[PDB]
């Protein structure tokens, strides 16, 4: 359970950039919702 | 603006033609052009090949006929061409070799009792998977793995013998589908086959 050693700058920038790329994937969805929130007949967002 | 990428690309290719020089082949070649004696001292250092020396387009092509040829000495004389140790341009760090083609893999001779006693066993990672498999079983089943197993242990199994492993073209039929560079037959130096 206890880690034997530490990680490099290598593997950490890989994992942190996979985390922040996983943050990248959930804003073109927000760009699509922000673009559909604009002028148009949409039956949502009262 | 497609003309930026296209026209500036052709300007970069244009100054690639203007600044840089081609690399002449090593055939009916003297020591130096008079430009080359002004350039680097490529004489007193050991000659190292450039990218225009190991192009896979103008490599040699060899065809043996493995009918009634013994396996291991054929594998060694295929190895000595698959490295490039019959060329004076032999550097053991680049791919100076030559493509070879081995037709008639189904009729490869062996000496003694190889056919019933020599085993091509293999194993996956888990225990109890060691596959009992003898020479006549492959030669009945898939014959072009015989020679392909003989010469794979003849080449330096790093990143570079793995690249010249693909130069081997073994076919079990009497005819090969290659008409690449009009493949000249392979020269032998082995008096005992």
């Amino acid at each position: 359970a206890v880690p034997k050693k530490r990680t490099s700058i290598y593997k950490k920038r890989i994992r942190k950039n996979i985390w922040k790329k996983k943050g990248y994937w959930a804003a073109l969805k927000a760009f699509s919702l922000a673009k559909s929130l604009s002028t148009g007949n949409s039956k949502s967002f009262f | 603006s497609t003309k930026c990428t296209e026209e500036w690309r052709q300007l970069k290719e244009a100054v690639k033609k203007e600044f840089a020089i081609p690399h002449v082949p090593l055939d009916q070649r003297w020591m130096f052009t008079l430009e080359e004696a002004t350039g680097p001292d490529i004489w007193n250092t050991t000659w190292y090949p450039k990218s225009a020396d190991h192009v896979p387009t103008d490599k040699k092509w060899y065809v043996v006929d493995a009918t009634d040829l013994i396996l291991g000495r054929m594998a060694s004389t295929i190895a000595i061409h698959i490295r490039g140790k019959n060329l004076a341009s032999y550097t053991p760090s680049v791919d100076m070799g030559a493509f070879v083609i081995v037709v008639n893999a189904d009729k490869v001779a062996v000496s003694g009792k190889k056919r019933t006693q020599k085993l091509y066993r293999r194993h996956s990672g888990r225990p109890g998977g060691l596959k009992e498999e003898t020479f006549d079983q492959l030669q009945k089943r898939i014959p072009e793995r015989i020679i392909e197993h003989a010469v794979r242990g003849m080449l330096p199994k790093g990143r570079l013998g793995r690249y010249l492993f693909n130069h081997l073209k073994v076919y079990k039929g009497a005819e090969h589908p290659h008409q690449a560079q009009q493949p000249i037959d392979l020269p032998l130096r082995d008096k005992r086959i």
């Binding site: - | 203007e18 003297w30 020591m31 130096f32 052009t33 008079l34 430009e35 004696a37 002004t38 001292d41 004489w43 007193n44």
Partner: protein, 147 residues
């Protein structure tokens, strides 16, 4: 504080293409030295020598600067058509050379350490080398061996 402007001198672009196409390429001819080639033996080691070449070698026992020095220990002198295979030396041979100023080459850090047996030695070595420029090769017109 603004975007600056368009500037208006009303220029006309010269598209004659007889000045820029003269300016951008360069005409530089290599000097034709001659069609000759030798292999000298200096110290112990042999050098490919052609007339005009800034070679490096060993001699700093004694040799003055800018001196005119004949390297008469020649084997395998070769022209464009024929070479002269030297039974050991080609006779009456003379590679005229210019022994130039003496040099010290790059530092070769000879640092030795064994293991936990605590021993380490930083020393350095500047090999006393000599650069030689080549004038011309002569005295080589015996026993031709062209093929």
């Amino acid at each position: 504080v603004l975007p600056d402007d368009f500037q208006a001198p009303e220029p006309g672009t010269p598209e004659y293409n007889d000045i820029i196409n003269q300016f951008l390429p360069k005409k530089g001819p290599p000097p034709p030295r001659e069609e000759i080639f030798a292999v000298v033996v200096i110290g112990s080691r042999q050098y490919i020598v052609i007339p005009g070449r800034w070679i490096y070698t060993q001699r700093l026992k004694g040799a003055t600067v800018n001196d005119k020095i004949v390297l008469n220990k020649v084997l395998l002198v070769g022209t464009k058509a024929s070479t002269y295979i030297g039974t050991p030396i080609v006779t009456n041979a003379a590679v005229h050379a210019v022994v130039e100023e003496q040099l010290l080459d790059d530092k070769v850090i000879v640092f030795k350490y064994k293991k936990k047996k605590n021993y380490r030695r930083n020393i350095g070595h500047r090999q006393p080398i000599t650069r030689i420029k080549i004038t011309g090769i002569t005295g080589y017109e015996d026993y031709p061996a062209s093929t």
